[PDB]
Design an enzyme around this catalytic site. Structure first.
Site, mmCIF file in Angstrom:
data_model
loop_
_atom_site.group_PDB
_atom_site.id
_atom_site.type_symbol
_atom_site.label_atom_id
_atom_site.label_comp_id
_atom_site.label_asym_id
_atom_site.label_seq_id
_atom_site.Cartn_x
_atom_site.Cartn_y
_atom_site.Cartn_z
ATOM 1 N N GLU A 14 0.842 -1.272 0.049
ATOM 2 C CA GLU A 14 0.094 -0.009 0.036
ATOM 3 C C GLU A 14 0.927 1.335 -0.164
ATOM 4 O O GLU A 14 0.597 2.130 -0.888
ATOM 5 C CB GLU A 14 -0.746 -0.061 1.330
ATOM 6 C CG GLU A 14 -1.992 0.927 1.163
ATOM 7 C CD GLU A 14 -2.767 1.256 2.323
ATOM 8 O OE1 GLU A 14 -2.275 1.889 3.367
ATOM 9 O OE2 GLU A 14 -3.842 0.601 2.617
ATOM 10 N N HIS A 15 1.884 1.139 0.675
ATOM 11 C CA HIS A 15 2.655 2.461 0.988
ATOM 12 C C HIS A 15 3.582 2.605 -0.343
ATOM 13 O O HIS A 15 4.255 3.625 -0.279
ATOM 14 C CB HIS A 15 3.818 2.323 2.227
ATOM 15 C CG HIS A 15 2.812 2.619 3.419
ATOM 16 N ND1 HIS A 15 2.210 3.834 3.526
ATOM 17 C CD2 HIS A 15 3.217 2.249 4.716
ATOM 18 C CE1 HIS A 15 1.696 4.133 4.991
ATOM 19 N NE2 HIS A 15 2.558 2.925 5.595
#
Ligand code: BOG
Lengths: 442, 48
Positions: free
Chosen positions: A57-58
């Site tokens: 996600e990051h």
């Protein structure tokens, strides 16, 4: 009202020759929000894979091969569009909100992410230390550690027990590979949904997606969706003590039915009865929610919340209160008493409101575009299609007293609960006690 | 000297059978409630 519901436009849905399901709700709003919602969470990770999806996600935003960081960021900012997202245990999603004058552009951006993240060996190593930090911040939020610990013990020894962010060890060492390995394994059309709501017209959407989502399935695996290993619930407790904190946190719960199941409505209606409190309310006269009233009369807590968090084939139906070192007991006593009351001697006067309060939520559940999209995204992904307010209505518009009891008692009475508690919890009685607080001396 | 005799013994029998049955039950019961402790597991986690 009923008409207002009856006149609420239908939500168009259609799958591709690919497998992706494309759904949306056309409104009028010059704005809108579109995004993809994945059938992937931490639940799908391994003891060594866990955290990937989050590490992932990051990086999802930090650029694609087709267009590096500096650009992607620049191109979105420049069009006044908003890109945000998240990932739970069984559900991840990335969504953008622009002026429905950009369905095609947004749609393209989307795809380019869920399909070609740069995964720059140089960027990764950075976010790695960003998480390890961000993680140590998620930590002091005793309101979240508590839930994690709950899941931990509640579904101990199973895929659910693992936290969505993952161990520091994993994050400290996941490989540029593992991330790719996680992406190419779970981000497949059959498990993904492209949803939208706004001034967008379905067709322009379909085509746009059908155009940038040029996926092709060869074998039968690709085309099929794997079912997960069941998760064993366990009546147990976990106590992270430390009188060093200002106040304690408690969370108790029984196993939940799971999306598919209908009762999740009656059960959803019951929670509306005990509701929630919070020192910023104005109400020693709060309609029912005696738990709240009592909480006010005898100063039982800083707040509390009733919740029916559920998953594919299981869930958690419980409650959580924040309280001072000294009122932990009474609070638990009084609350646990309400569940019993709830499923042993409920009344129509109660359920009646219960319903209403739900319906009002049920509706404000769709206040805006971003949130609507969230429903289509979810609904499809977890239910199979979309449930129109018009429907939810009936479902929960026909729950009487006897219905609440029958169910609540079916899921709560004499069941071995799963409690968790961090902070100054010396006053919280033993398991055995909270246990026998699960049957009323009828 | 002790007309009870026979009565006192038939009684002794019935008592022995109750002890036999009663203690194991309460034993299992005692063992049951406690288990929550006997099985318990501590752990010390200072943030260092
Ligand atoms: C704690 C365990 C107590 C055991 C029960 C005591 C049983 C006494 O039982 C006695 O048995 C006699 C012989 O048949 C009868 O004549 C008596 O009427 C009867 O009361």
């Amino acid at each position: 009202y009923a008409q207002a519901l009856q006149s609420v436009p239908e939500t168009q849905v259609s799958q591709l020759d690919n497998g992706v399901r494309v759904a949306s709700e056309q409104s009028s709003q010059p704005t809108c929000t579109v995004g993809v919602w994945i059938d992937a969470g931490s639940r799908y990770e391994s003891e060594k894979n866990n955290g990937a999806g989050y590490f992932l996600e990051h990086l999802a935003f930090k650029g694609t091969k087709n267009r590096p960081q500096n650009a992607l960021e620049k191109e979105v900012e420049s069009m006044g569009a908003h890109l945000n997202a998240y990932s739970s245990r069984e559900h991840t999603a990335y969504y953008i909100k622009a002026l429905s004058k950009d369905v095609p552009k947004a749609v393209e951006l989307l795809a380019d992410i869920v399909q070609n993240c740069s995964l720059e060996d140089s960027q990764i190593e950075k976010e790695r230390d960003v998480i390890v930090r961000e993680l140590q911040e998620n930590d002091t939020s005793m309101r979240e550690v508590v839930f994690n610990y709950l899941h931990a013990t509640a579904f101990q020894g199973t895929g659910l027990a693992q936290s969505v962010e993952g161990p520091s060890e994993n994050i400290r060492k996941l490989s540029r590979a593992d991330l790719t390995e996680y992406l190419s394994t779970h981000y497949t059309a059959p498990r993904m949904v492209l949803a939208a709501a706004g001034g967008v017209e379905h067709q322009q959407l379909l085509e746009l997606a059908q155009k940038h989502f040029g996926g092709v399935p060869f074998t039968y695996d690709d085309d099929a969706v794997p079912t997960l290993s069941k998760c064993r619930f366990t009546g147990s407790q976990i106590r992270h003590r430390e009188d060093g904190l200002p106040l304690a946190h408690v969370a108790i719960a029984v196993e939940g039915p799971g999306w598919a199941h209908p009762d999740l409505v009656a059960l959803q209606v019951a929670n509306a009865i005990i509701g929630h409190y919070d020192r910023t309310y104005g109400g020693g006269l709060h309609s029912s929610s005696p738990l709240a009233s009592i909480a006010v009369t005898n100063k039982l807590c800083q707040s509390f919340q009733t919740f029916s968090i559920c998953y594919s084939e299981t869930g958690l139906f419980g409650f959580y209160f924040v309280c001072d070192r000294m009122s932990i007991d009474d609070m638990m006593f009084v609350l646990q008493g309400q569940w019993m009351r709830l499923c042993t001697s409920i009344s129509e006067s109660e359920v009646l409101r219960g319903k209403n309060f739900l319906r009002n939520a049920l509706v404000s559940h769709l206040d805006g575009t971003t949130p609507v999209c969230e429903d289509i995204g979810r609904e499809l992904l977890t239910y199979g299609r979309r449930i129109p307010l018009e429907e939810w209505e009936e479902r929960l518009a026909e729950v009487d007293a006897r219905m609440v009891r029958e169910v609540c008692s079916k899921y709560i009475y004499d069941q071995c609960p799963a409690v968790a508690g961090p902070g100054p919890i010396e006053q919280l009685p033993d398991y055995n006690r909270i246990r026998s607080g699960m049957f009323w001396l009828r | 000297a002790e007309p009870e005799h026979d009565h006192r013994k038939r009684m002794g029998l019935k008592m022995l059978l109750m002890m036999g049955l009663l203690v194991p039950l309460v034993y299992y019961m005692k063992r049951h409630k406690w288990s929550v402790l006997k099985s318990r597991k501590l752990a010390y986690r200072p943030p260092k």
